[model samples]
Target: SAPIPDLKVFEREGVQLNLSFIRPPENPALLLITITATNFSEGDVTHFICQAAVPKSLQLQLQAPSGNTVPARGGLPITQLFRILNPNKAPLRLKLRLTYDHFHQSVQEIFEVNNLPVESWQ
Candidate 1:
């Protein structure tokens, strides 16, 4: 089982890019998106994939205590990714950035392993 990340830790709303698919009136969404970081640095920027239901006026962005910016994919808006996601369905290009302290939270504390066997000691 995967652990759910509590938003309280970040103290900010996560970026949710809108896709091109219209939200079905009766059916609700099941998949909840959780943003994860890979090799995030103190200030280095990166991109990710995002998707959302269509016809909703909701706007999404990469938000932080300092500020935020509208997310994009391949240098374009998220709306484009929706079209190419599955050909038959919607897609989302969700690339986000973490600046300064925000990047620090995503990193796991790693410790150096010492006093190990040198060769075939297994």
Candidate 2:
């Protein structure tokens, strides 16, 4: 693997997102991306769902989230795992959509992520 880029944090709508990236040199085309979601709002979060898309040059697989519930006000974190493969060594840009219950209300947000580790596609 190239330089191990450990973590990234992003916040939106009172929710914080942490991404931990892992690569297995055993397969150059594969990368494991883990997401940790923390709630910082007055209400808890539930029924969490994450969906992502990438250009056809790359392929993506998203596993189930670790849990659907995140406590309120900087409480526990909910985790989800993402798997990606890039046979063409193409660059990556992840457009993600998040859906969840925030303090008893349903909410949705869309965001983009980039600058993944070079090992992710090298």
Candidate 3:
């Protein structure tokens, strides 16, 4: 078993994007990550998309987000699931970025997941 990412919330444009770990990776070089997006302000969230980046030898695979829109005023969150492959198990790092349309502008934010869980890489 492994631990959850305690630093889970990243906020921008009055929207919160959360990162979570649901369980231990089935393989040493793999991890399943979850993203939940919530809208707390008046404007609904649309054109919602999320992305991640990694090093030369690693691989990433993402599923489509739960929906095109994230409801407004503290409604249910939009969830996404993705897997990362680290066959080479090189020093692990991630650059997470997400974007969405709110209040007539496209809001984008980039964050680093540096404090990655230690056990997953083994």
How accurate locally, in lDDT, is each candidate? Answer: 0.26, 0.79, 0.76
Clash pairs (backbone) in predicted model 3: none
lDDT of 2 by residue, 53-84 (tens): 88898889889887888888888788888899
Say which prediction, candidate 2 or candidate 3, comes out ahead on lDDT.
2
lDDT of 1: 0.26
Residue runs of model 3 more than 4 Å from their true location after superposition? 22-25
Candidate 2 TM-score versus the reference: 0.84
Per-candidate TM-scores read 0.21, 0.84, 0.83
Best by TM-score: 2
Off by over 4 Å in 2: 1-3, 7-9
Model 3 lDDT vs. the true structure? 0.76
Clashing pairs in 1: 21-54, 47-95, 48-94, 48-95, 49-94, 50-92, 50-93, 50-94, 82-91
Give the lowest summed-lDDT range of ten residues in model 2: 1-10
Give the count of colliding residue pairs in each prediction.
9, 0, 0
Candidate 3 structure, TM-score to reference:
0.83
